[PDB]
Structures are given as C-alpha cells and as structure tokens.
C-alpha cells in the first residue's frame, strides 16, 4: 500500500532536447497544489506529470518545488538532476524493397538500385523503436579504383553528391565501398562522429 | 521525490545501483528483496544483479517504524540487454600512455603492438567490459580487390599481421564483422572502423 521510491541511479538522469516526464510528488499533497521551476530549459505540467526539456548538456538541472496549503509558502528540497547528451546514433541506408516496404540497411549486401533510390545516408538509435530523430550533416564514401587506390568522396549534406552517384553506378556485383566520416546531429543540439558501415554491391 | 518516469530498467549481468527510499525513513530501516538475481545493500543504495534478458524483476520493499514492519507497494522493472559496444584498438603512445584508437590514422607499429581488437561503450557509464569474439580485416590489393581476413578470436591472425606489415603510409584497411559478447551473455554484431596507416 505505501509508496516506496525505487530509482536505478543510471536511469535517474535528464536528456537534453527531448521530453523528460518527471513524477514530482509530495506525500499527502494533491497534484494541483504542487509548483515546480527549473534552471535548465522548461518545466511545464501535463496534468499530474511534469515535462522537463533541458537545453545545456553537462550542466546540472535544479528543480525547485513549492506548495501552498500550510503556513505561508512551504519550501521543498531543491533536487538536482544530471543533464546528459542523447546516446550517439548509428548510420543506415533507408531503402524500399520490391514490394514497396521500407527497410533499414545496417551492413552486408545491398542492390545498386536500392542504394541509388535511397539517395543518401540516415542515422538513428538501433533499439530503436520510435523515438529520437537524428540528422546526417555530412559523410564520405570510400571507393577502390582499378589501381587499388582509395577514393574518398564528399557528400552533399545527407544526400549523395553527383561524384558519389557516378562511383556507385559503375560498381560491379561483389564490389565494396565504405560509408565513413559520418557526422550526425541530434535534438540535444549535439554534433557527433559515428562509426563506418561496409556496403557490398548485390 | 523528483523521479524521471522512464527509469524501471535494469541491465542483465552487471551491477545496477538503485536508490530505494521511503519518505521520512532512515536507510537502515529499509529492507528490499528481488525475484530475479541478487539485491545487495551497499551504503545508501541497493545493488541489483538480474540474470535473464527480456524478463521482469519485482522489487519488494519493507520499512521499519518502531516495532512494526510495513510492506510497501512492489515495483516491476524490465531486465534489458546491455547497450551494444563499439570497436577500438588499444595502443601505447611513444610516452607509454594507453590510448583508444576509434578511427582515423594510426601507425603500423601501434597497430601490431596492440595485437588485436577491443570493444567498449563510448561513455563513462556503465561499469561494463565486453569481449571481441571474432572479427575480419578487409585489405585492398593493387587490382582493387577486397581481401577479407579472419581473426584468431580477439587477436590478429598470422595472415592479418602479414597484411598489416606490408601496408605503406596512407594505405587503408577496415575492421569489419566484429562479433562482441557482454556480461549479459549476449552476442552482437557491431559496426566497422576504418584504419589509415600513418
């Protein structure tokens, strides 16, 4: 019957640039009397709930809680939460199969038509399932010519450049290229370099 | 109590510190049990070590108030697989300091002295060590053909070492098909890294 707070310390953090629902509770006090402020972003109410949307990664967030029912102004403690960057995403190629279903290529073999129809590179948390949207700022494709030289080709933002497209078009079955130097941005406002993926032409 | 709602997650195979608190009750008066793995008191925290991935762990809490044990409401938590690690090459610089190569340029001597590949989370949290089960190195010949070479567990095979030894400055190779294992007992395939010989 009485409520104990069971909080894993690795999970008791706020993430910059996303919805952070927080259960702010005062024993024996109805939701309508509780009032809260934050020194990193916004703290708006969603009924019983509180949504923290902090902005500065690494800076600590101070949650001041006040209530009016007793004396004059009851001062609560005064809690501090760590504001972390979102996890770093992984690159993928979003393609449509022959039945028109959307799929995510995450390494291995992929048809030339599927690569070119995708038109570029994407980045997301693998988990996934929804949940946070990341953007590809830029990336390189590394090709290998007939002389065995590495040919790094710069992108057009998240899209393949015309030089990249020409290189992909002239690849034979079983030839390989690498998606490298992938720069991804998240709603936390953080830019990150993420790992490479190998693409084998089908 | 100011608690982020999405927090009923424990990771299998590692220590999960939990702040279990009852308002107005001293830590020593709080007792807790788990139905999945172990739950050990350590200072002001309880350390959960659950075992099966995809299962639920129920934490039962009691509080002592005078001569009476009060049963608190039970808490259900999801036991999850650990996050997937990223590959790196552990090398020693010219001053003998241990460094983690995570892509870019690396000297041939540093690659060979490392003797193999490692895998870890690219984050201060959690307290986790992963193991490289197997990997491939993909080299490119003068005809532009890819030469995939199989490892000796986490170590470079003799064929890999010979290929690395004959690489000139500016030549590239790829660490691919990296299979890693974690203390959650899960095997995962992780992304590639490009190595540019400096």
């Amino acid at each position, epitope marked *: 019957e009485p409520m104990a707070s069971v909080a894993p310390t690795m999970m008791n953090v706020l993430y910059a640039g996303i919805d952070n629902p927080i259960n702010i509770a005062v024993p024996g006090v109805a939701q309508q009397n509780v009032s809260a402020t934050i020194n990193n972003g916004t703290l708006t109410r969603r009924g019983n709930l509180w949504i923290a949307r902090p902005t500065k990664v690494g800076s600590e967030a101070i949650i001041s809680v006040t209530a009016q029912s007793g004396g004059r102004t009851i001062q609560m403690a005064k809690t501090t939460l760590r504001v972390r960057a979102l996890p770093d995403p*992984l690159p*993928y190629i979003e393609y449509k199969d022959v039945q028109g279903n959307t799929k995510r*290529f*995450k*390494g*291995g*073999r992929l048809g030339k038509r599927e690569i070119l129809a995708a038109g570029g590179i994407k980045a997301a948390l*693998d988990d996934d399932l929804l949940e946070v949207n990341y953007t590809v700022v830029k990336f390189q494709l590394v090709f290998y010519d007939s002389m065995g030289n590495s040919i790094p080709e710069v992108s057009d933002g998240a899209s393949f450049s015309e030089r990249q497209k020409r290189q992909i078009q002239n690849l034979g079955k079983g030839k390989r290229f690498y998606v490298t130097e992938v720069i991804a941005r998240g709603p936390d406002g953080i830019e990150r370099k993420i790992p490479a*993926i190998e693409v*084998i032409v*089908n | 109590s100011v608690a982020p709602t999405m927090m009923n997650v424990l990771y299998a195979g590692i220590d999960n510190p939990i702040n279990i608190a009852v308002p107005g009750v001293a830590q020593q008066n709080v007792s807790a049990t788990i139905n999945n793995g172990t739950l050990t008191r350590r200072g002001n925290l309880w350390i959960a070590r659950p075992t099966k*991935v*995809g299962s639920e762990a129920i934490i039962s809490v009691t509080a002592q108030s005078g001569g009476r044990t009060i049963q608190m409401a039970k808490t259900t938590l999801r036991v999850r*697989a650990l996050p*997937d690690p990223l590959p790196y090459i552990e090398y020693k610089d010219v001053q003998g300091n241990t460094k983690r190569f995570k892509g870019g340029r690396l000297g041939k001597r540093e690659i060979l002295a490392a003797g193999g590949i490692k895998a870890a989370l690219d984050d201060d949290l959690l307290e986790v060590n992963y193991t490289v*089960v*197997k990997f491939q190195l993909v080299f490119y010949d003068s005809m532009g053909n890819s030469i995939p070479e199989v490892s000796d567990g986490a170590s470079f095979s003799e064929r890999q070492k010979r290929q690395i030894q004959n690489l000139g400055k500016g030549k590239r190779f790829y660490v691919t*098909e990296v*299979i890693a*294992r974690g203390p959650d*007992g*899960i*095997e*995962r*395939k*992780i*992304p590639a890294i490009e190595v540019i010989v400096n």
Partner: nanobody
Framework: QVQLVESGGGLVQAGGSLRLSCAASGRTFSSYVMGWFRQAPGKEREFVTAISWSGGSIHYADSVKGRFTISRDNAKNTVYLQMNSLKPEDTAVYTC???????????????????????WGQGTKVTVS
C-alpha cells in the same frame, strides 16, 4: 541474393529422429545468424531455433528444448537441425532462415522475430506418425 535450400524432410514415427540440412549459396554464410521456423496446418508459424554468427549463442523454442539441436558448418555453408524424440505436434513444413547481416544484438526476442530474417528457404515437410 543468398538462396537457401533445405533437405532431409520426410515421414518418421513418433519417438524417432530426423536431421534436416540447409545449404546457403554464396561465400557470406559466416556473416549470418541461421535458424529454423515451422508451419503446421491450421496453426500460427512458430520459431524453432537459431544460432549466432560464432555458434557461441543458441536460442530454442520451449517446446523443442532438450529434443532439438542446431549446429552450423561454415566450411560447408550449411546449418543443421537434429530432431530427436519426435512428437505428432512436430508435424510441419520446416523453413530455414538467414539474417542479422548488419549490426545488432542476437537476443531471444530478436531470434523469434520473423522480420529479423531477410532470407527464407523453400520449406521441407516433416510428418510425424
């Protein structure tokens, strides 16, 4: 483009044993998680078993645990399903699968997910009398 061809299906008496084989085309077998699903008449498709890239991790359906064994031979590009103590409930079309070519973990949950496998076999009929 990987093609899977199963063999070894047929009629077997209850309590009996049968080994199914599945040969994969190409030279990338080692990059896949290999497995088996089964389809009985008037029943939902059920996951049977799957084996990790290295062979170090295997997942079995509860109904086959301790009766069926999976193994892989990378040199022969073949996955095997050894069925022992066969029951009439094991009567089904058995289909070999290959997936997990890209990054991602091999959990009990992902092993059971039909959407995690890009390549599916022809199916082989197993009849337990």
């Amino acid at each position: 483009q990987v093609q899977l061809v199963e063999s070894g299906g047929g009629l077997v008496q209850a309590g009996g044993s049968l080994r199914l084989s599945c040969a994969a085309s190409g030279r990338t077998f080692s990059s896949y998680v290999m497995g088996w699903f089964r389809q009985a008449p008037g029943k939902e498709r059920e996951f049977v078993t799957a084996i990790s890239w290295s062979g170090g991790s295997i997942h079995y359906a509860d109904s086959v645990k301790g009766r069926f064994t999976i193994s892989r031979d990378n040199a022969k590009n073949t996955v095997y399903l050894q069925m022992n103590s066969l029951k009439p409930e094991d009567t089904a079309v058995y289909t070999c699968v290959a997936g997990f070519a890209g990054y991602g973990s091999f959990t009990s949950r992902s092993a059971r997910d039909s959407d995690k496998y890009d390549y599916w076999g022809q199916g082989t009929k197993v009849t337990v009398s």
